[PDB]
């Protein structure tokens, strides 16, 4: 068996000539040559069976990506694992191989307005399909946007994805949240569980702002610092937007703050396209009910060169799963059963 960065990567005989790409807490990704299709692929080794959270994320992603098929969404081409539950210590997911990601690009590359326009179009085109399946990504950020040498974009990492549940979205003030801080919508810190489509739109808005200047727009250093960065730019919420927040602790926190004026988008982004800033404003709307939806965003004048709703496909049916109260052993069983279709037997 081939070894990489001092770890076993037993994917053979089908996949050979492994080269390191990157890694996570419970996984590792390598590039490898597919001997059947005669192409280099990306292989993600995951070792999640020791922690139930890692099992839940592994299972959510495998189930979703096996039902999804879209040009702007990473696929699962094959799954390698041992033939029995007992012998299965790791799972290997064979996926699209991509040269870079938007996090990597933004560290060193200035994006032309045409690149920002095309990247945003592909993000929203992929997002339309995800939302049409009644699924929320819930962790959109530049490192979850993969790009190949011709600028084709694919959304990856569905580990934190959920089925949309807008009727059970309300919660208390400063409620614990898992998704990446800098891309969190203001309502997460105030009264939302992140169970509505508007949560993904906010993250896309943050990504657009980051593409315009190569810097995250709201780089909070801790939980409540995130809301203060957002308010620092949007300004104080209006009476109407406050009246939509019925939770007293959340509302009174906003009321306790001195008045702050909105920082104009053309002051933060003086070289940006005016149509891009108009769309940014609509994605970065404080009130999640007033926030632009993915299909409206696609129809915005800024994306007129690409907009074609007949070439922006939707899922063949909504998604339906309950993994919250399932032990790591039972989740191992479901990972085994979900990956059975790829075994030679």
Residues with catalytic roles: 139
Among 11, 15, 18, 26, binds ligand EK5 (CB under 6 A): 26
Q: CB under 6 A: which stretch of 94-102, 122-130, 196-204, 232-240 binds ligand EK5?
A: 94-102
Q: Write out the two tokens for 220.
A: 């909070």
Whether 58 and 46 have beta carbons less than 8 Å apart is answered as yes
Closest to 146 in 3D by CA, of 191, 104, 83: 104
Return d(Cα 32, Cα 40) in angstroms, integer. 5
For the CB of residue 248, give the shortest distance to ligand EK5 in the complex, in Å: 38
- 98 counts as binding ligand EK5 under rule CB under 6 A: yes
- 145 counts as binding ligand EK5 under rule CB under 6 A: no
- 142 counts as binding ligand EK5 under rule CB under 6 A: no
Return d(Cα 184, Cα 201) in angstroms, integer. 10
Return d(Cα 28, Cα 339) in angstroms, integer. 18
For the CB of residue 180, give the shortest distance to ligand EK5 in the complex, in Å: 12
Among 5, 16, 22, 249, binds ligand EK5 (CB under 6 A): 22
| Residue 12 known to bind ligand | no
- 201 counts as binding ligand EK5 under rule CB under 6 A: no
Q: What share of the chain is helix, strand, coil (3-state, %, to 5)?
A: 40, 15, 45
For the CB of residue 26, give the shortest distance to ligand EK5 in the complex, in Å: 5
Q: CB under 6 A: which stretch of 5-13, 15-23, 237-245, 269-277 binds ligand EK5?
A: 15-23
Q: Write out the two tokens for 58.
A: 């592994």
For the CB of residue 68, give the shortest distance to ligand EK5 in the complex, in Å: 13
- 138 counts as binding ligand EK5 under rule CB under 6 A: no
Q: Write out the two tokens for 129.
A: 């399909």
| Residue 26 known to bind ligand | yes
Per-residue contact string for residues 204-233; x = within reach of ligand EK5 by CB under 6 A: ------------------------------
Return d(Cα 272, Cα 264) in angstroms, integer. 12
| Residue 21 known to bind ligand | yes
Q: How many CB atoms lie within 10 A of CB 60?
A: 19
- 101 counts as binding ligand EK5 under rule CB under 6 A: yes
Strand positions, DSSP E, the chain: 15-23, 27-34, 39-46, 78-80, 91-95, 100-101, 135-136, 145-147, 153-155, 162-163
Q: CB under 6 A: which stretch of 38-46, 62-70, 266-274, 313-321 binds ligand EK5?
A: 38-46
Among 2, 23, 281, 293, binds ligand EK5 (CB under 6 A): 23
Q: Write out the two tokens for 124.
A: 């929203």
Among 80, 97, 189, 212, binds ligand EK5 (CB under 6 A): 97
| Residue 27 known to bind ligand | yes
Give bridge partners of residue 32 from the DSSP assignment. 41
Long-range contacts of 107-111 (CB under 8 A, 24+ apart): 107/214, 109/214, 110/214, 111/211, 111/214
Among 9, 11, 27, 234, binds ligand EK5 (CB under 6 A): 27
Per-residue contact string for residues 40-59; x = within reach of ligand EK5 by CB under 6 A: --x-x-x-------------
Among 72, 95, 180, 285, binds ligand EK5 (CB under 6 A): 95
Radius of gyration from C-alpha coordinates of the chain: 21
Chain-centroid distance, C-alpha 89: 27
Q: Write out the two tokens for 227.
A: 């809301």
- 169 counts as binding ligand EK5 under rule CB under 6 A: no
Interacting residues toward ligand EK5 by CB under 6 A: 21-27, 29, 42, 44, 46, 74, 95, 97-98, 101, 146, 156-157, 159
Cite the annotated binding site for ATP by residue number: 21-29, 44
């Amino acid at each position: 068996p081939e070894m990489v960065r001092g770890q076993v990567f037993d994917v053979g005989p089908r996949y050979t000539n492994l080269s390191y790409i990157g890694e996570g807490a419970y996984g590792m990704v390598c590039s490898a040559y597919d001997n059947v299709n005669k192409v280099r692929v990306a292989i993600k080794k995951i070792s999640p069976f020791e922690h139930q959270t890692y099992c839940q994320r592994t299972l959510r992603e495998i189930k979703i990506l096996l039902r999804f098929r879209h040009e702007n969404i990473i696929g699962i081409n094959d799954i390698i694992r041992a033939p029995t539950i007992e012998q299965m210590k790791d799972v290997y997911i064979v996926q699209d191989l991509m040269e870079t990601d938007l996090y990597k690009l933004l560290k060193t590359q200035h994006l032309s307005n045409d690149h920002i326009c095309y990247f945003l179009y592909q993000i929203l085109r992929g997002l339309k399909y995800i939302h049409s399946a009644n699924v929320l990504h819930r962790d959109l950020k530049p490192s979850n946007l993969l790009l190949n040498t011709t600028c084709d974009l694919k959304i990856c990492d569905f580990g934190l994805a959920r089925v949309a549940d807008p009727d059970h979205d309300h919660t208390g003030f400063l409620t614990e949240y898992v998704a990446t801080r800098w891309y969190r919508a203001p309502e997460i810190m105030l009264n939302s569980k992140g169970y509505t489509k508007s949560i993904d739109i906010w993250s896309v808005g943050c990504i657009l702002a980051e593409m315009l200047s190569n810097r995250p727009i709201f780089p909070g250093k801790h939980y409540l610092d995130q809301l203060n960065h957002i308010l620092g730019i949007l300004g104080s919420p209006s009476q109407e937007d406050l009246n939509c927040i019925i939770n007293l602790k959340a509302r009174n926190y906003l009321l306790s703050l001195p008045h702050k004026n909105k920082v104009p988008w053309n002051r933060l982004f003086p070289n940006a396209d005016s149509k891009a800033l108009d769309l940014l404003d609509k994605m970065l709307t404080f009130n999640p009910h007033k926030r632009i939806e993915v299909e409206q965003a696609l129809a915005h004048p800024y994306l007129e060169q690409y907009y074609d709703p007949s070439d922006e496909p939707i899922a063949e049916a909504p998604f339906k799963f309950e993994l919250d109260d399932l032990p790591k052993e039972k989740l191992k069983e479901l990972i085994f059963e979900e990956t059975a279709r790829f075994q030679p037997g």
